[PDB]
Design a protein around this ligand. Structure first.
Ligand SMILES: [Zn+2]
Length: 46
C-alpha cells in the first residue's frame, strides 16, 4: 500500500496468469506450475 495510487514500486516479478507477486525469480517459476493443468488419463467422467 502506497499513498496515492499503486504502480510506483512493485515486486521485481509478478505473475500474469492470476497476478501474484514474488521476490525470488525461482519462487515465481514454481507457482507458474499451478497454472499448468494436467488432463487426467482416460475419459473425462466415468
Ligand atoms: Zn498466477
Amino acid at each position: 500500500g502506497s499513498s496515492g495510487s499503486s504502480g510506483t514500486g512493485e515486486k521485481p516479478y509478478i505473475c500474469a496468469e492470476c497476478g501474484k507477486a514474488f521476490t525470488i525469480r525461482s519462487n515465481l517459476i514454481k507457482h507458474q506450475k499451478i497454472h499448468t493443468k494436467q488432463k487426467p488419463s482416460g475419459p473425462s467422467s466415468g
